[PDB]
Write a protein that binds this ligand. Structure first.
Ligand code: NA
Ligand code: NA
Ligand code: NA
Ligand code: NA
Ligand code: NA
Ligand code: NI
Ligand code: NI
Ligand code: NI
Lengths: 89, 108, 108, 89
């Protein structure tokens, strides 16, 4: 059996595929898919940047999609921000 | 309430804090604390690496971007992203399709 | 132009050599992608080149636009992945100390 | 012998290490290292954004350094931009 930390990492994979498997390329989250990901999975202080602002930041190769590596950029930034907020209370 | 993604990130933060905490206050992971986290909570994802203590120490050195023999959470979370990426790559190792399917990931 | 610019120019020129052949001048169809991989990535993708089904699924994975062809934006992600994979090969099982590169991808 | 394309990919690794091996962590390019990297390796239309703007965009985990994966973000963006420039007058 995997540990709780290891389960959390595999669960992050599953979270991404809930949106990447909606349509098109299996490992591509398009702009409208990213909007739903942000609205469902991220807290308000992350959503407040705007889905279009996040999408432009994450689509590194400007191909109109966010792949899994680019999604991990969002995960890293969400984690650093969540740690910082927990480190202020 | 928290989303699935928020809970996963919370698990990462709390696991980091369980080994870094110093006199009840948040801190950084030294090499000894990093090895204990890796030995226990990454015993499957880093099963082979855990057999070579020098390999674990060099992973620490590679992540120690601040060159202070300590892993802040910012330094540590890069390992979490790499292992998440590596586990997904394991799910698609030698994939021929068609369609999308995940084989077992890291440590399985 | 700098070393980095010349390397990027090599990537662009190689892509263009195959994308001009058929269909749209700035996309690779599957046949041209296989030819590029077979010739210009014969070492970096040596094992994958032995299984045509694997090459076709790499194409499908890179086809983020879901249009059965690779624009340069889609193709350059393969270049970043292979560059990363080669550097990971140089540090495979690294124990340190210091920095050292073993041979990279393609045993070179 | 590696092909010319494969040599180009390995040369991109060597470019990064010219600056990451200057000081500190072997796979970290600090703020002053990145400014030198941009001034030496990238064309004017890339440099004009400014080293500080590039550094903020590349330092995903906000740890004060650019590692190799974060450097590949710059390579991807330089490559996409250089391809567009090849089709312009
Ligand atoms: Na998709
Ligand atoms: Na993209
Ligand atoms: Na074409
Ligand atoms: Na450095
Ligand atoms: Na960084
Ligand atoms: Ni997948
Ligand atoms: Ni073109
Ligand atoms: Ni290296």
């Amino acid at each position: 059996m995997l540990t709780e930390l290891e389960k959390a990492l595999n669960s992050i994979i599953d979270v991404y595929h809930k949106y990447s498997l909606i349509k098109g390329n299996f490992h591509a989250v398009y702009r409208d898919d990213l909007k739903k990901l942000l609205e469902t999975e991220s807290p308000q202080y992350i959503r407040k940047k705007g889905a279009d602002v996040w999408f432009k930041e994450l689509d590194i190769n400007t191909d109109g999609a966010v792949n899994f590596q680019e999604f991990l950029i969002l995960v890293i930034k969400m984690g650093v921000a969540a740690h910082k907020k927990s480190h202020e209370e | 309430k928290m989303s699935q993604l928020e809970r996963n990130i919370e698990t990462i933060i709390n696991t980091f804090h369980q080994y870094s905490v110093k006199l009840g206050h948040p801190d950084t992971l030294n090499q000894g604390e990093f090895k204990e986290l890796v030995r226990k909570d990454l015993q499957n994802f880093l099963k082979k690496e855990n057999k070579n203590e020098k390999v674990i120490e060099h992973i620490m050195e590679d992540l120690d971007t601040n060159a202070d023999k300590q892993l802040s959470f910012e330094e540590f979370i890069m390992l979490m992203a790499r292992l998440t990426w590596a586990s997904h790559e394991k799910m698609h190792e030698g994939d021929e399709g068609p369609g999308h399917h995940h084989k077992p990931g890291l440590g399985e």
